[PDB]
């Protein structure tokens, strides 16, 4: 196709990260509003950005959920790493959950630069490394001032389905946040 | 990282690595020579090498272990397999709107007759679009110029 | 390790240095920065380059940025090494002063090693003279090849 020095031919290759589904989670993107983190070939996690809210509570009962191991510890770990990676997290009233019956669901109210809405989108942008840029309109050239039009960021548990249309899955997203965990929080 | 990768039972030479048809998307299996993959243990600045250790660890963990879902295992070997700061570099490049590597596509120089290939470097992406061959042509030139020197030794 | 990538030579402007003019270093010198992991001067180049690069390519409202690239720029354990030397009252490097060997005629310089300090006083040239000797002896071998 294209030769260099007359003898060397330029060739390419594209890796299929879907193989790693058993050992590590894989993050991909469907459309502007929906993003996913697949942990296995059965269970998974859905990252959605919608103006429509699901949880009306203002309190997140974790201790009650921790007693009843109905949830999946794998999915509960990858959502635990997310919250710790959020920088400069101070107000907890914007965070609401609902772990009744094992169904894990967390909602972040983004209606409240250098705000709590940025930190959530900042961690979310790294988590869905595949196609996060489609979500933010002012992504390029903005770090602390990233913003959206959506009001809520909901994370729910879902079953595996072939919906990685916009971007192929990859673990690099989740891998990066493991080091960032518990490194930008204030004192309680 | 400290993971040592090696293809046991590999026919051609010891130390090389082959990517199966399942490891690649819409492509057949591809093998790489010892001279190329040897740089993976030496250098710390290659994204493709980090993927090989992930694919090898994923393969190694599957055949040698009993799955119960096995998330704790990776959460401990992360730093021993990939270069965490190499992920940070690409994120900084994306934040500054520099062409960055999303770890999917790679490019290498394959000899038409000899068959010796270079270590595939990552194909950078800008605005969800891979760079044209022209925009990093001089990167291929230094690779082709380095391909000669390595064979000379 | 670190991964920041800083043709290939580096020049320190008159603003980067204190009471000194701009100074440039050859490719062969700065090439050691990517190879070795235990050089303080190289960590400063990546800090000055990251600070320079971030300014022109970004719009300041910027503390969160550095808090994520610290490990990708400098060697954290290299800072710990100097702290241990200070705690044990060994001459340590406070990252301010460096010394290098400049060829009077050729102009080739070595990679500037840190000038150690003991009790707020920089060491005399005599107290680390043998360090300069091994550097000058190594400078020849590089010049030969």
């Amino acid at each position: 196709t294209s030769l260099y020095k007359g003898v060397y031919e330029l060739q390419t290759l594209e890796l299929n990260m879907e193989t790693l589904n058993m050992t590590m989670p894989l993050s991909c993107t469907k459309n502007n509003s929906h993003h996913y983190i697949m942990v296995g070939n059965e269970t998974g996690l859905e990252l959605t950005l919608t103006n429509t809210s699901i949880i009306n509570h203002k309190f997140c009962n974790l201790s009650d959920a921790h007693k009843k191991n109905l949830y999946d510890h794998a999915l509960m770990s990858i959502i635990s790493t997310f919250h710790l990676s959020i920088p400069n997290f101070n107000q907890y009233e914007a965070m609401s959950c609902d772990f009744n019956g094992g169904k894990i669901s967390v909602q972040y109210n983004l209606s409240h630069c250098g705000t709590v809405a940025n930190g959530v989108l900042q961690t979310f942008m790294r988590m869905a490394w595949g196609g996060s840029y489609i979500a933010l309109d002012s992504g390029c050239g903005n770090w602390d001032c990233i913003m959206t039009s959506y009001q809520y960021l909901i994370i729910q548990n879902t079953t595996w389905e072939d919906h990685c249309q916009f971007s192929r899955p990859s673990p690099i997203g989740y891998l990066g946040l493991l080091s960032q965990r518990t490194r930008d929080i204030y004192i309680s | 990282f400290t993971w040592t990768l090696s293809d046991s039972e590999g026919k051609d030479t010891p130390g090389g690595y082959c990517l199966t048809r399942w490891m690649l998307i819409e492509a057949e299996l591809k093998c790489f020579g010892n001279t190329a993959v040897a740089k993976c243990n030496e250098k710390h600045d290659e994204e493709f090498c980090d993927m090989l250790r992930l694919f090898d660890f994923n393969k190694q963990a599957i055949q040698r272990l009993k799955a119960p879902t096995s998330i704790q295992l990776i959460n401990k070997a992360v730093n021993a397999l990939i270069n965490d700061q190499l992920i940070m570099k690409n994120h900084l490049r994306d934040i500054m709107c520099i062409p960055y590597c999303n770890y999917s596509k790679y490019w290498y120089l394959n000899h038409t007759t000899t068959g010796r290939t270079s270590l595939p470097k990552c194909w950078l992406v800008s605005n969800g679009s891979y760079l044209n061959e022209t925009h990093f042509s001089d990167d291929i030139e230094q690779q082709a110029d380095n391909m000669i020197t390595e064979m000379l030794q | 390790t670190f991964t920041w990538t800083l043709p290939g030579g580096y020049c320190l402007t008159r603003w980067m240095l204190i009471e000194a003019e701009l100074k440039c270093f050859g490719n062969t010198a700065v090439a050691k920065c990517n190879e070795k992991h235990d050089e303080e001067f190289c960590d400063m180049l990546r800090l000055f380059d990251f600070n320079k690069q971030a300014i022109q390519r970004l719009k300041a409202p910027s503390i969160q940025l550095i808090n994520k690239a610290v490990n990708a720029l400098i060697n954290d354990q290299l800072i710990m090494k100097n702290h241990l030397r200070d705690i044990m009252c060994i001459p340590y490097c406070n990252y301010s002063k460096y010394w290098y060997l400049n060829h009077t005629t050729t102009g080739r310089t070595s990679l500037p090693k840190c000038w150690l300090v003991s009790n707020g006083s920089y060491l005399n040239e005599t107290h680390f003279s043998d360090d300069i000797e091994q550097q000058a002896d190594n400078m020849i071998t590089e010049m030969l090849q």
Partner: antibody
Amino acid sequence: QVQLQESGGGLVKAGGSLRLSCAASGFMFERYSLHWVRQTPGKGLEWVSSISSLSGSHINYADSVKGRFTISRDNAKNSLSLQMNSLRVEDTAIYYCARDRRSGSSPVPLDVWGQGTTVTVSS
Amino acid sequence: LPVLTQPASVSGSPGQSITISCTGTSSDVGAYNYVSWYQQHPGKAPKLIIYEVKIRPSGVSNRFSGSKSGNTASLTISGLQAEDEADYFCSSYSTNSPWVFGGGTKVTVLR
């Protein structure tokens, strides 16, 4: 000082041929990629052709130029050449040779430009 | 025909701030962030005033600034001075060719 100098401009008949040169002064010629940008005396700049660094394996031409111009380089001789053929009257412009580096990691823009050589086409 | 559309001329009083717009297609200006601006004085060769949209080469006055929004780049010259009266061109990476240049704009310091 880092310099680039052109040579070979002059009067040529319509349909003839002309040969241009570009010499380096004060930098490593091989590492960089070189281009040819002509400027119509009364109009803006137009990119013509490009040559990759080291071995000139990657060559690019403009659609208004393709098939008629042929670029070449000699790293040892530090000379960049452009061969013109089937010259049209509209090719009359001031031709410059500029450098840059096409790297994904450390790219270089068209920083160094030559003084330019004037080429006139009229039979 | 010029690939990038540039205004005929932009003018301003000494000490003012004027901006030149470099409008392109989605395949060039919008695709990449390699947009360059050149200052050409009469008789001289184009001098690289800004590269990579907003990065400024060493030795260029801090009065020159670059911007971009979608398919349009903007070169802003604040604190106009008589020495700035020259012709300005813009260039960018392209999917079809390595470089695509603009028609050019003449900046006049209204005296």
